[PDB]
């Protein structure tokens, strides 16, 4: 997260770290058994680390749980990173407590101008902001006109832009898969951009509100 601040510990209790040797993507706990992340973060088995604030220190709050199933959206497209959403089923349910709490799925799509929070342990492009401690940033959703003007012909219905066209504040590498939460609902998943925090290149996010049908039917299993 570039241009943000260290989160109050456990203020984003849905935030998870996906780890396979080291932190490589974030995710969001949506109930005791399932995590939502980005489809490009796919690995066939991952360890999900919950209750984290500083990922390099054991603090006592952590739960580390292996995945049992990692399911990419059927229409994910790696060429253009379209439909970039994935579900991870935990091999055992998370214990919900002060440190670990799910985030609600959206009841409707949030309109442009809504203020949201994005968080993660990715690159901060700063000598003073430590990416091992969870960083937080407040970003507005941008209109489709601004988003498509920044990235001509690249923005699909499964994507939205959020951030600042002036640059300076953005998500960055190592934040993929993490939450964009707006008024207590998971509206976006960190997905892609041209660099990080560059003028005229706001971050692009997977639009969760159009995936409610697939998310809730898949979390039912078979």
């Amino acid at each position: 997260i570039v241009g943000g601040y260290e989160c109050k510990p456990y203020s984003q209790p849905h935030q998870v770290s996906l780890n396979s040797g080291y932190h490589f993507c974030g995710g969001s706990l949506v109930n005791e058994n399932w995590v939502v992340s980005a489809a490009h973060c796919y690995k066939s088995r991952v360890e999900v680390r919950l209750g984290e604030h500083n990922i390099k220190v054991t603090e006592g709050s952590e739960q580390f749980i292996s995945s049992s199933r990692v399911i990419r959206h059927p229409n994910y497209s790696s060429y253009n990173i379209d439909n970039d959403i994935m579900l991870i089923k935990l091999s055992k349910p998370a214990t919900l407590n002060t440190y670990v709490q799910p985030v609600a799925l959206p009841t409707s799509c949030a309109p442009a101008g809504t203020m949201c929070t994005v968080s993660g342990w990715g690159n901060t492009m700063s000598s003073t902001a430590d990416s091992n401690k969870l960083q937080c940033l407040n970003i507005p959703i941008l209109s489709y006109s601004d988003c498509n003007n920044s990235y001509p012909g690249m923005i699909t219905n499964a994507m939205f832009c959020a951030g600042y066209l002036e640059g300076g504040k953005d998500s960055c590498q190592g934040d993929s898969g993490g939450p964009v939460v707006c008024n207590g609902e998971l509206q976006g998943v960190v997905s892609w951009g041209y660099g990080c925090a560059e003028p005229g290149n706001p971050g692009v996010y997977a639009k969760v509100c159009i995936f409610n049908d697939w998310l809730t039917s898949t979390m039912a299993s078979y």
Binding site: H40, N123, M154, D175, S176, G193
Partner: peptide
């Protein structure tokens, strides 16, 4: 340069996803 925000170690551009390149520090960006 569509570059997904995943943290990925690289030695060459070909290690990275989409239009990410291997930056000097040994990671895609």
């Amino acid at each position: 340069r569509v570059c997904p925000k995943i943290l990925m170690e690289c030695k060459k551009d070909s290690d990275c996803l989409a239009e990410c390149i291997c930056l000097e520090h040994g990671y895609c960006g």
